[PDB]
Amino acid sequence: GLADVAVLYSGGKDSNYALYWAIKNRFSVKFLVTMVSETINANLTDLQARALGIPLVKGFTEVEDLKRVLSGLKIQGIVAGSKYQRKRIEKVAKELGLEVYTPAWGRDAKEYMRELLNLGFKIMVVGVSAYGLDESWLGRILDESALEELITLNEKYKVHVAGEGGEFETFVLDMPLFKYKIVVDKAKKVPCTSSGKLIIEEAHLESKLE
């Protein structure tokens, strides 16, 4: 009634952490909200929404568009997953008279990443844009072993261990809240620079006993 909120869901580790945080903090998540600007590679959050059972609202566009979509939802606040993007979301939250939560902000990278692993988050690298991360990273799962490598790479090339700054993009395949697990069947990964993306061609949900 007064704990009603929408979660800004991009399908990555931060969107999913913001979702987990919201539920564990007694918030009532009415909707996951994803914005799309001008295949299953585009409906990945849909796949996750199904696994979650939480209604997904999709808007199309970039700031005004989001505001307009949120304004049509009966919520008291929104949970968000750059450093100024924060204020851009606080701007719309204030203009719409909504509370804004950013559970994933000043958290220490190393600690943050370790917490996602203990919580049972299964994360896959879907994009890389940093020197010291060849295409080999595209498609790998982030486990304790992977985190250690990111820590090392950090102590050399100073790459953020949480991908902060476009270092790398992620997609959550599984989490305690997912009623279903996501499995990637076909993927195409596409270097002078250090730009690279993983295109999920085929994927499906597998029932979990929870």
Add this chain to the structure above:
Amino acid sequence: GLADVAVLYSGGKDSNYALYWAIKNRFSVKFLVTMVSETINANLTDLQARALGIPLVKGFTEVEDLKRVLSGLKIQGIVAGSKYQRKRIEKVAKELGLEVYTPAWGRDAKEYMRELLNLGFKIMVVGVSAYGLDESWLGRILDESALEELITLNEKYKVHVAGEGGEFETFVLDMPLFKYKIVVDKAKKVPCTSSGKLIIEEAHLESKLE
């Protein structure tokens, strides 16, 4: 402000007609709502939502689930596309204190279908479940020629010219309101009975100059 509504969108001719009717009647369509029960063949309405530019809300399940999703939207009514399904939607509309519009109801089949053609609706048969409609129908576009055949088939096997009763299912590829046209690139159509479905494997949007 008081003309705010959601459209029950299944992606067929009736959902799209209900959308067209709503817009032309000065209604403010805040959301298209699709329910999914337990590839692009599942996100077809997403493809249409993109072509339309109208936010799409997806719920998961069947009547309670819909009610719960609608209750989280700031709308004054809903526009709907069996004969008792009507009352099932009027039931949730009343319980949620919302107006209910069914622009596609007592309309004469022949007239209705002819009106969709003049309005510029490009419709493809995606399912068939009636004697007198072999697999050949699966995937064909409904033009004046096709309507005439449905009229003939009606004057013989008495098959509804609008598919009323599971006769056939449809998917709108284009309409005056679509900013983009939908094109099917790959499709797989799957007879002792008369059951048959068309599975759209690959499709894309092509820009329109409007």
